[PDB]
mmCIF file with all atom_site columns, C-alpha atoms (C1' of nucleotides) in Angstrom:
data_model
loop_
_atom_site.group_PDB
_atom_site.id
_atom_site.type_symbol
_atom_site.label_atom_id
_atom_site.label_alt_id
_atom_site.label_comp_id
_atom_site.label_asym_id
_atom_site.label_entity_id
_atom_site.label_seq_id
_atom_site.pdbx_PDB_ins_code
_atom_site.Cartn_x
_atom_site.Cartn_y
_atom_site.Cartn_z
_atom_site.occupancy
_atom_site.B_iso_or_equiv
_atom_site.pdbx_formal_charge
_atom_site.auth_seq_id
_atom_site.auth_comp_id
_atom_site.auth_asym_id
_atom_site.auth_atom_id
_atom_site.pdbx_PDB_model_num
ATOM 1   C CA    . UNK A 1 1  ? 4.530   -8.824  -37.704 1.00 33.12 ? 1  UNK A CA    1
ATOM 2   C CA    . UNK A 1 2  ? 3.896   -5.646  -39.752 1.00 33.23 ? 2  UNK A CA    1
ATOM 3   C CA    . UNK A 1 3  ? 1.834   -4.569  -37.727 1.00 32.49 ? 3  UNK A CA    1
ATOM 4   C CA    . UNK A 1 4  ? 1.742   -1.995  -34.031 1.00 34.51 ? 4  UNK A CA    1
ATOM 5   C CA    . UNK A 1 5  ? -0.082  -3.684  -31.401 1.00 34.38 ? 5  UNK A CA    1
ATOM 6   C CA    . UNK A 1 6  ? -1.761  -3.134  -28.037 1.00 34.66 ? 6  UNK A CA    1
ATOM 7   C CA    . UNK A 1 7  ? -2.879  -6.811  -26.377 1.00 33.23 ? 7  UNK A CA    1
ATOM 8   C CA    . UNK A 1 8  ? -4.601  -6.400  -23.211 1.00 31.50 ? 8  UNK A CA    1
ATOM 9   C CA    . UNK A 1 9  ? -4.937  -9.290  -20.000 1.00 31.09 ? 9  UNK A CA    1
ATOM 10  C CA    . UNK A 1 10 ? -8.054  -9.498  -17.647 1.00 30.49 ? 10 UNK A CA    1
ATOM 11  C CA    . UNK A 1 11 ? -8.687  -11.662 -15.199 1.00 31.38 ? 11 UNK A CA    1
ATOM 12  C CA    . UNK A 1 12 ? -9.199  -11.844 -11.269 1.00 33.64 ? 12 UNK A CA    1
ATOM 13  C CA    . UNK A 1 13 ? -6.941  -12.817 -8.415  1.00 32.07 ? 13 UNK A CA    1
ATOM 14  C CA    . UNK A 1 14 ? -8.912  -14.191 -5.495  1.00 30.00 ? 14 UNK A CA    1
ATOM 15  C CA    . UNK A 1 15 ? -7.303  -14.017 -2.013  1.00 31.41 ? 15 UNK A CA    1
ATOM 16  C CA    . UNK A 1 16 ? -7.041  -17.934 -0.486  1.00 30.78 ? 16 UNK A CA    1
ATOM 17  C CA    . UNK A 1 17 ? -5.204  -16.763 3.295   1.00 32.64 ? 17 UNK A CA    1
ATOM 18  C CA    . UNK A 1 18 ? -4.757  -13.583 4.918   1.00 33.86 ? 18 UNK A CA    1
ATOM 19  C CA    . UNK A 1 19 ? -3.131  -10.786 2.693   1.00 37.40 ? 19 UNK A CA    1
ATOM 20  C CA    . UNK A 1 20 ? -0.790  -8.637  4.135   1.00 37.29 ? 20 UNK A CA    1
ATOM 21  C CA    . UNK A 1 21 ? 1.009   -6.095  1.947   1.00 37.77 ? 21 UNK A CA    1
ATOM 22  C CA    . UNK A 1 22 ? 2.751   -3.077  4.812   1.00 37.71 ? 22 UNK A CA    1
ATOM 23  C CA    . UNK A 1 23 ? 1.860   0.491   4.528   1.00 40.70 ? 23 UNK A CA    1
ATOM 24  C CA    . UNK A 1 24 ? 4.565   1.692   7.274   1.00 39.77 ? 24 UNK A CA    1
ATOM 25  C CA    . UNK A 1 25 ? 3.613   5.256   8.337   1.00 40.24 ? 25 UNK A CA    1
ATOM 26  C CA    . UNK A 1 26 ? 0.694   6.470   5.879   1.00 41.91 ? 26 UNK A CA    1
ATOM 27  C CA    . UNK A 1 27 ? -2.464  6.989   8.306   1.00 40.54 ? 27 UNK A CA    1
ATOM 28  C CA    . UNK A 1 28 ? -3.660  6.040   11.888  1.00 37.48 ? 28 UNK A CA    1
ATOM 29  C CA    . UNK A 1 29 ? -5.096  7.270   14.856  1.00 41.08 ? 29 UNK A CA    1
ATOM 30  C CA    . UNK A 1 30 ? -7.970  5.092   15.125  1.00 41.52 ? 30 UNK A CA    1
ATOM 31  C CA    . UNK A 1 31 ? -8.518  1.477   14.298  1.00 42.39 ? 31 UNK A CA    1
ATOM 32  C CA    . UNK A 1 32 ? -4.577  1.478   14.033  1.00 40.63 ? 32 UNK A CA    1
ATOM 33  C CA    . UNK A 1 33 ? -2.596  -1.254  15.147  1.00 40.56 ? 33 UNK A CA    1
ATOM 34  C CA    . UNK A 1 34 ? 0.983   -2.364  15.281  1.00 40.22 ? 34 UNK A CA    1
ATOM 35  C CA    . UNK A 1 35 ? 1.285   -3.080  11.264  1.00 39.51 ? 35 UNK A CA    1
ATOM 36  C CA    . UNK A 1 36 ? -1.639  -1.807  9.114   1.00 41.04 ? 36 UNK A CA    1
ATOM 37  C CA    . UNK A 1 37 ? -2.058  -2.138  5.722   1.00 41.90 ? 37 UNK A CA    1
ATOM 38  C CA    . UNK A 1 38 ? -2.212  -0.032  2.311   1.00 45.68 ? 38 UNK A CA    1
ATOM 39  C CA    . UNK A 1 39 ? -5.546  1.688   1.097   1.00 48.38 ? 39 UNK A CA    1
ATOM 40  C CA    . UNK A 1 40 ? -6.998  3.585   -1.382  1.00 51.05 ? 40 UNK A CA    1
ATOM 41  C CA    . UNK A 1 41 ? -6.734  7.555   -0.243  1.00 50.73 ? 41 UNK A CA    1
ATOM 42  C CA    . UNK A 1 42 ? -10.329 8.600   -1.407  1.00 52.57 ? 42 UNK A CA    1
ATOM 43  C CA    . UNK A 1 43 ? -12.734 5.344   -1.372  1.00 54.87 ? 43 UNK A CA    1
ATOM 44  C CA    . UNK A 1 44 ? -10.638 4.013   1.598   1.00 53.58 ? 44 UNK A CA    1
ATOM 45  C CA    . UNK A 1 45 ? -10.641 0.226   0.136   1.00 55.20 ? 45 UNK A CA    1
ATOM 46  C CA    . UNK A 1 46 ? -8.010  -2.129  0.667   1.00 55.68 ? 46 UNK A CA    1
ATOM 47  C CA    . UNK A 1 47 ? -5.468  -1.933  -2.687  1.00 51.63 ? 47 UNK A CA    1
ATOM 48  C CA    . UNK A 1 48 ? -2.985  -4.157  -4.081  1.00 50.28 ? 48 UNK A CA    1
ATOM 49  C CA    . UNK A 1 49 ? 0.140   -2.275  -6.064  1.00 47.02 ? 49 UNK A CA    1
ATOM 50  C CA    . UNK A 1 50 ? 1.582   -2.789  -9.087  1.00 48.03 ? 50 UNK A CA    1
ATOM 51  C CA    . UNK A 1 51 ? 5.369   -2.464  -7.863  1.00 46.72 ? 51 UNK A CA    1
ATOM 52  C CA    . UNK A 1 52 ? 4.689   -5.114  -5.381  1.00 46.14 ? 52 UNK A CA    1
ATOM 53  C CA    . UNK A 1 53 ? 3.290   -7.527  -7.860  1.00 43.12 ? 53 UNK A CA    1
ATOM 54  C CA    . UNK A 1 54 ? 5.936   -6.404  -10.985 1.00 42.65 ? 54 UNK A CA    1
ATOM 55  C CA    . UNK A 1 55 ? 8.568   -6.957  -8.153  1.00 41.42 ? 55 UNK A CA    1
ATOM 56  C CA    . UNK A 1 56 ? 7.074   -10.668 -6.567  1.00 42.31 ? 56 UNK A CA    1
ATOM 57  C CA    . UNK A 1 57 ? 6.986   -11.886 -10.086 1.00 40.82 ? 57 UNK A CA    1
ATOM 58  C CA    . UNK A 1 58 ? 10.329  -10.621 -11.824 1.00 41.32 ? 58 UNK A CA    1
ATOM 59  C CA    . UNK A 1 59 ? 12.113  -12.051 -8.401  1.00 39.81 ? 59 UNK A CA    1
ATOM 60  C CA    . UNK A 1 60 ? 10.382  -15.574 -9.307  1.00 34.28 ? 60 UNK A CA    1
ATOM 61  C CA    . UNK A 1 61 ? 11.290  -15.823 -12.495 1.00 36.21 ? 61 UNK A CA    1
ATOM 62  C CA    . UNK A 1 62 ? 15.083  -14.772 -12.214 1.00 38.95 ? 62 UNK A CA    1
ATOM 63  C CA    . UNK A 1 63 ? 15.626  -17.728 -9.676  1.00 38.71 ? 63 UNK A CA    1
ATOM 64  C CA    . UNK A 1 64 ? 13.733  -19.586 -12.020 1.00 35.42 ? 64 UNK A CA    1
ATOM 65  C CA    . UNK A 1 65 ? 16.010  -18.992 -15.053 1.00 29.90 ? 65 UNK A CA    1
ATOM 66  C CA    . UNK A 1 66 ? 19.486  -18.502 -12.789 1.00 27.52 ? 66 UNK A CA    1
ATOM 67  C CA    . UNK A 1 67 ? 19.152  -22.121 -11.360 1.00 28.65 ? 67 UNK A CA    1
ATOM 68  C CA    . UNK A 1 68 ? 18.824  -23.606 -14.552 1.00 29.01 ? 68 UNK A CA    1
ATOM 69  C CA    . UNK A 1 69 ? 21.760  -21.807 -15.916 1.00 31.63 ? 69 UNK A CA    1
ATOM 70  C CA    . UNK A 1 70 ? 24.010  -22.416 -12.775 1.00 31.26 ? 70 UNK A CA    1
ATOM 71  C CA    . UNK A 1 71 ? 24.464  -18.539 -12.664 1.00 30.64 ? 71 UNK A CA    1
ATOM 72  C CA    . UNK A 1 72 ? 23.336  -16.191 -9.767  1.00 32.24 ? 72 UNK A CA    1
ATOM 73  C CA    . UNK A 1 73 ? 21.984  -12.924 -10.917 1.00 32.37 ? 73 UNK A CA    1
ATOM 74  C CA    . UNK A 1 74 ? 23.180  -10.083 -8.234  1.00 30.78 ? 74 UNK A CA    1
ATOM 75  C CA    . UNK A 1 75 ? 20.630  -7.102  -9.919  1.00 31.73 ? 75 UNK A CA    1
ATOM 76  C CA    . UNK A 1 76 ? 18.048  -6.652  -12.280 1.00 29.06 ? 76 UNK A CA    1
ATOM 77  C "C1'" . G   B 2 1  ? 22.021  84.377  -39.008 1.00 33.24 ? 1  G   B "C1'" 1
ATOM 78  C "C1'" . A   B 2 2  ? 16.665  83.860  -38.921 1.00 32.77 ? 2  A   B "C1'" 1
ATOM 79  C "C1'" . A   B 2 3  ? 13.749  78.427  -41.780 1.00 27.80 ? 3  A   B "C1'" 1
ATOM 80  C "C1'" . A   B 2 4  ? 13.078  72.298  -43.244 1.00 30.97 ? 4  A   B "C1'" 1
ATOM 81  C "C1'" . C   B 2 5  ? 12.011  64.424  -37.432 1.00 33.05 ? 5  C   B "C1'" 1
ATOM 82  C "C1'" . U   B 2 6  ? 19.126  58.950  -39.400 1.00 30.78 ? 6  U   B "C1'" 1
ATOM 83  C "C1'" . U   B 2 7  ? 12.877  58.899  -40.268 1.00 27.85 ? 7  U   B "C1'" 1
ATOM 84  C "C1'" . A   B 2 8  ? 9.124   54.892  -42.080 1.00 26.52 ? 8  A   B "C1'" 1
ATOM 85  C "C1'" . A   B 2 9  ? 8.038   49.493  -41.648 1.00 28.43 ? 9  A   B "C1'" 1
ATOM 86  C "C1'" . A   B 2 10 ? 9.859   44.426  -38.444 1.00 32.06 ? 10 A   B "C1'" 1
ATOM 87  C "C1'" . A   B 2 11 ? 6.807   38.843  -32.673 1.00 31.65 ? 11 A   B "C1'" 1
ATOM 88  C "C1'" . C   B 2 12 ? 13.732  36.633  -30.067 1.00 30.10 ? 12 C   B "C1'" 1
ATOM 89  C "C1'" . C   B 2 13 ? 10.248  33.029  -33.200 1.00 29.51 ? 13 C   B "C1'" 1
ATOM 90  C "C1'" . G   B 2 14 ? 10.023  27.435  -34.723 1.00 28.46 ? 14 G   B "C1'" 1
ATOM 91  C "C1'" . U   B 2 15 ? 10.947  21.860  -32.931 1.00 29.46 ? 15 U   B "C1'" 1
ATOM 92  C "C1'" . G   B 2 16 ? 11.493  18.952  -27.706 1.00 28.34 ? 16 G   B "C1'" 1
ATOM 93  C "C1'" . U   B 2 17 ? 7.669   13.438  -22.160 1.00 27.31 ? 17 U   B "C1'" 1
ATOM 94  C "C1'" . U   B 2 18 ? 11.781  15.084  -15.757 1.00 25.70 ? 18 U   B "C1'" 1
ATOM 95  C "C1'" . G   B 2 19 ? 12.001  10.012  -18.718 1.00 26.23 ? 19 G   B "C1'" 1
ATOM 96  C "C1'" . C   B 2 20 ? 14.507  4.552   -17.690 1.00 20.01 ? 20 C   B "C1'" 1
ATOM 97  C "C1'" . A   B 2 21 ? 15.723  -0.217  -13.638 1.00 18.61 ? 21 A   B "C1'" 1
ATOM 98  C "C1'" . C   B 2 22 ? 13.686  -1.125  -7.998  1.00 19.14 ? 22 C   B "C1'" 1
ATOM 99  C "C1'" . U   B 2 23 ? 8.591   -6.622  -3.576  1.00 21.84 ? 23 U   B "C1'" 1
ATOM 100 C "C1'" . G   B 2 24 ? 7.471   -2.233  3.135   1.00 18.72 ? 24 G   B "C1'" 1
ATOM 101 C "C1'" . C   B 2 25 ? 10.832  -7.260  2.897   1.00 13.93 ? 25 C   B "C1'" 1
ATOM 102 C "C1'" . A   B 2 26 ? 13.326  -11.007 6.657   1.00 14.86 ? 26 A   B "C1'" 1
ATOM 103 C "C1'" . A   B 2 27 ? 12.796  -13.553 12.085  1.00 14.52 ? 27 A   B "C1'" 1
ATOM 104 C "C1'" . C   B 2 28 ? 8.320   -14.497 16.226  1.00 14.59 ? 28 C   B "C1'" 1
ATOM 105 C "C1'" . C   B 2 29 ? 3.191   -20.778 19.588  1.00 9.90  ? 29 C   B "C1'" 1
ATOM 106 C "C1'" . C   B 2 30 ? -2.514  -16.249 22.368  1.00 6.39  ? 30 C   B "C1'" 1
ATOM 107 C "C1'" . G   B 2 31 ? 1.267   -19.465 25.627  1.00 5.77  ? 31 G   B "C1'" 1
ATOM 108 C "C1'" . G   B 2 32 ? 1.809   -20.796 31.480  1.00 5.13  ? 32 G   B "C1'" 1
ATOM 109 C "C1'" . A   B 2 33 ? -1.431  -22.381 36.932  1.00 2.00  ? 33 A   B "C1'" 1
ATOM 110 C "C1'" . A   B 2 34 ? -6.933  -24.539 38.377  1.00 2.00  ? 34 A   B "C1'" 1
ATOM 111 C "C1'" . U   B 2 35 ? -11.192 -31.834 40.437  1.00 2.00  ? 35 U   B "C1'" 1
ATOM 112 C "C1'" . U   B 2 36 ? -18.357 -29.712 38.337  1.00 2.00  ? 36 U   B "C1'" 1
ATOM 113 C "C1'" . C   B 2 37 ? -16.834 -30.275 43.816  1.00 2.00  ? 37 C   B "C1'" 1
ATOM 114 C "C1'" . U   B 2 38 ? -19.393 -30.388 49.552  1.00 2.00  ? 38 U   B "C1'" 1
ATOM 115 C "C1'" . U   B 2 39 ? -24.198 -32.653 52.838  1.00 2.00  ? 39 U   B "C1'" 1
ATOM 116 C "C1'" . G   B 2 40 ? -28.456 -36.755 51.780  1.00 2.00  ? 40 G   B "C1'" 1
ATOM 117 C "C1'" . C   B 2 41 ? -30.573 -45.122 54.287  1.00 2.00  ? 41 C   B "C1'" 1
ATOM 118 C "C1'" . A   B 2 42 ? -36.148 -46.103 48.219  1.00 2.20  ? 42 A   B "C1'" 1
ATOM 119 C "C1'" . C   B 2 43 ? -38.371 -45.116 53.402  1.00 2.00  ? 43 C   B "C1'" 1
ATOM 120 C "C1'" . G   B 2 44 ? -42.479 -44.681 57.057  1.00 2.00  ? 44 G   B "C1'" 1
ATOM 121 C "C1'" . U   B 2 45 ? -47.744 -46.145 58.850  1.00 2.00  ? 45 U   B "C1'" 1
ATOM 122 C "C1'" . C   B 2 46 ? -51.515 -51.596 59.728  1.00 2.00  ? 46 C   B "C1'" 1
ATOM 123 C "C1'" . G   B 2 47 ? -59.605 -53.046 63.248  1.00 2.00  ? 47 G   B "C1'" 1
#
RNA sequence: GAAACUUAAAACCGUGUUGCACUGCAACCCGGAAUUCUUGCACGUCG
């Protein structure tokens, strides 16, 4: 390529049902329920991660590749 | 024997990512019981 490169990907990601990704025991005590969800820690808006979205999409493609290859792969 | 500084000058310094892989996930009906019912003549009065 001869050359060092640095290509960039924008785009959105609109929410169609409910969205639900667990927070477990960060914060509480009022307007907590039974399973809350995970949040900024300053502005207090609702956040999506980048390990749950690396990790939803590496898991999607490795069935994707290991059932056209008739081979199961146990790890990353 | 009484009398004349093994002194002067000199950075423990230069280079180096606590870094690489990892879904807060799987299973769960806001469901089960309950009559918009009870009483009521389209009728009375005729130089």
């Amino acid at each position: 390529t001869t050359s060092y490169a640095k290509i960039e990907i924008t785009g959105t990601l609109t929410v169609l049902t409910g969205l639900q990704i667990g927070a477990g025991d960060g914060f509480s005590a009022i307007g907590a329920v039974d399973k809350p969800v995970v949040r900024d820690p300053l502005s207090r808006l609702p956040m999506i991660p980048g390990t749950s979205l690396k990790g939803k999409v590496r898991t999607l493609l490795s069935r994707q590749y290991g059932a056209d290859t008739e081979t199961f792969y146990r790890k990353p």
